């Protein structure tokens, strides 16, 4: 039933202090249960990182330290460090059996470790053997962007098209930038009846759009 | 050393039964507390419930009472979660963990068991090809590509020219779309002056479905 709201992303550079706030109630936080904090590395088992509001258990640097008034607490990494890149948990309880252990939605730590890299984006309009197959897909593919963090936004002329648009999480690729497609599927007829059809991929504040059209 | 150890993804039609398993060592299994835990796609962590391996006393979170059964096996100290019946949104991953006592927090922590329930039935891919471009690529290069299509379930092997060709090339992952069919690109970039010269041909193999293809990747000209 009830949930601490953390925020879904923190990131900083490498040395600075970074701090993850952890939203509770009246019921669990504000009632007077204690905070736990949990750190998880790509891939790994949760690791007890805090218990007890600010108590560290051994193996955990006193790098972190946590907190907690009214109905909130929070979580402060000094020195960031690369091994700090990760999701973190608040968990806490409350009175109610749903409440037994009340868990934080999660907060992943980016470490910045290297410049920001711009995304290159190529954009595919149908092959016309996927039209005689009934079917049509634009493909916008983005590459050697950092940090690993997109929006994609598909527009039909001027308008914006939200149906039948996918697009992946980005995923590191062999130079350590990322990589992230976006996927537009439309019916042939829809294909053919406007003039043109855009991707528009928002990085860090700047957006490249690119702009394919059936009359090709 | 204090160790869970969970069993690995699973991959179920809405309907069927499952079960998974958290196997404990380095301690003494009996006296602890254990949970399972549930993160749904793009969600938190939710309790669903406990159990003492001692007696197997059991208390569940009231969203998964009769949805799940927990159970515990001293002889070989392993807990387990169990469904009777799967629905689509069970899908999720699903940790091992050992309470602490008095506090209400957890001190180890399993991996994490990907479940995933799906209707989705094995499929081959359709490939279809992404015609040479010139516009976001280099001086003097292109792109082209193959586009692989509604295929279950991961993963496809693409190579190019019979794995000659090699740099390059760029695999996209895969996404996966309402449908449930998994669908990925991959690109290479080749000198614009080799287009008229050279065939590409990228090899697609899925072994789920025993599909293998070999597609011709040709200007449009």
């Known amino acids: 039933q009830s949930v601490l709201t953390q925020p879904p992303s923190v990131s900083g550079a490498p040395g600075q202090r970074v701090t993850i706030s952890c939203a509770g109630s009246?019921?669990?936080?504000?009632?007077?249960?204690?905070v736990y904090w949990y750190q998880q590395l790509p891939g790994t088992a949760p690791k007890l990182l805090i218990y007890?509001?600010?108590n560290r258990p051994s193996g955990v640097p006193d790098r972190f330290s946590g907190s907690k008034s009214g109905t909130s607490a929070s979580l402060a990494i000094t020195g960031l460090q690369a091994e700090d890149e990760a999701d973190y948990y608040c968990?806490?309880?409350?009175?109610?059996?749903?409440?037994?252990?009340?868990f934080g939605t999660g907060t992943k730590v980016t470490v910045l470790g290297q410049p920001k890299a711009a995304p290159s984006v190529t954009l595919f309009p149908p092959s016309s053997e996927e039209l005689q197959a009934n079917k049509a897909t634009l493909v916008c593919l983005i590459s050697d962007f950092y940090p690993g963090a997109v929006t994609v936004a598909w527009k039909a002329d001027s308008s914006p098209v939200k149906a039948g648009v996918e697009t992946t999480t980005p995923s590191k690729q062999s130079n350590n930038k990322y990589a992230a497609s976006s996927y537009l599927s439309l019916t042939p007829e829809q294909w053919k009846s406007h003039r043109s059809y855009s991707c528009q991929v928002t990085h860090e504040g700047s957006t490249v759009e690119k702009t394919v059209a059936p009359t090709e | 050393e204090v160790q869970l150890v969970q069993s690995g993804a699973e991959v179920k039609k809405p309907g069927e039964s499952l079960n998974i398993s958290c196997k404990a060592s380095?301690?003494?299994?009996?006296?602890?507390?254990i949970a399972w835990v549930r993160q749904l796609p793009g969600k938190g962590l939710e309790w669903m419930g406990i159990?003492?391996?001692?007696?197997?006393?059991?208390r569940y979170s009231p969203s998964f009472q009769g949805q799940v059964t927990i159970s515990a096996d001293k002889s070989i100290s392993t807990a387990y979660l169990q469904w009777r019946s799967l629905k689509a949104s069970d899908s999720a991953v699903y940790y091992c963990?050992?309470?602490?006592?008095?506090?209400?927090?957890?001190?180890?922590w399993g991996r994490g068991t990907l479940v995933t329930v799906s209707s989705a039935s094995t499929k081959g891919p359709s490939v279809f090809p992404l015609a040479p471009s010139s516009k976001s690529t280099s001086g003097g290069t292109a792109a082209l590509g193959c586009l692989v299509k509604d295929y279950f379930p991961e993963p496809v092997t693409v190579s190019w020219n019979s794995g000659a060709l090699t740099s390059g090339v760029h695999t996209f992952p895969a996404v996966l779309q309402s449908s449930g069919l998994y669908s990925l690109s991959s690109v290479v970039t080749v000198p614009s002056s080799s287009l008229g010269t050279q065939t590409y041909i990228c090899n697609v193999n899925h072994k789920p479905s025993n599909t293998k293809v070999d597609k011709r990747v040709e200007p449009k000209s």
């Open positions: 007890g509001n600010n």
């Open positions: 159990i003492y391996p001692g007696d197997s006393d059991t």
């Open positions: 380095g301690y003494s299994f009996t006296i602890y507390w």
């Open positions: 968990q806490s309880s409350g009175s109610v059996l749903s409440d037994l252990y009340v």
């Open positions: 009246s019921s669990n936080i504000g009632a007077g249960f204690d």
């Open positions: 963990a050992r309470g602490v006592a008095v506090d209400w927090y957890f001190d180890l």
